[PDB]
Ligand binder design. Structure first.
Ligand SMILES: O=C1CC=CN1c1cccc(NS(=O)(=O)c2cccc(Br)c2)c1
Length: 127
């Protein structure tokens, strides 16, 4: 399509672990953000066709979204929490790259990011 293949959510040869922090990221961090009133644009990969953003994947070369992150967590895709947190960071950063300060979508991302920051502050220690 005008859309690239979505980011993988499984990769059999990638090393992975379950850690208490990754569990936390799924059951609390992801879950909380997912139910937020501003979550909906971020619950799936950007559909450049449907949303009429033909320039999106000209600009964003490392796409990420909470839908991909959710599956990745459900599929135990990650080696550690930092890998997952990086995916969240990429998603926010993409939004701030593609869009303008004060855009509705940026306001939504900003709200989610500050909530994200609160929630990872409460991340349980790891070993
Ligand atoms: O950059 C990202 C990351 C996730 C979605 N987007 C994004 C960015 C620009 C436009 C749109 N299209 S839209 O229909 O979802 C839309 C339009 C106007 C306001 C709001 Br809120 C939402 C989506």
């Amino acid at each position: 399509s005008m859309n690239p293949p979505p980011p993988e959510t499984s990769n059999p040869n990638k090393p992975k672990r379950q850690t208490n922090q990754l569990q936390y990221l799924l059951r609390v961090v992801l879950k909380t953000l997912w139910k937020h009133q501003f979550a909906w644009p971020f619950q799936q990969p950007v559909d450049a066709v449907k949303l009429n953003l033909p320039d999106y994947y000209k600009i964003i070369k490392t796409p990420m979204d909470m839908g991909t992150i959710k599956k990745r967590l459900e599929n135990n895709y990650y080696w550690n929490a930092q890998e997952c947190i990086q995916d969240f960071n990429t998603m926010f950063t993409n939004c701030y790259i593609y869009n303008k300060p004060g855009d509705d979508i940026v306001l939504m991302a900003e709200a989610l990011e500050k909530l994200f920051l609160q929630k990872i502050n409460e991340l349980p220690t790891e070993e």
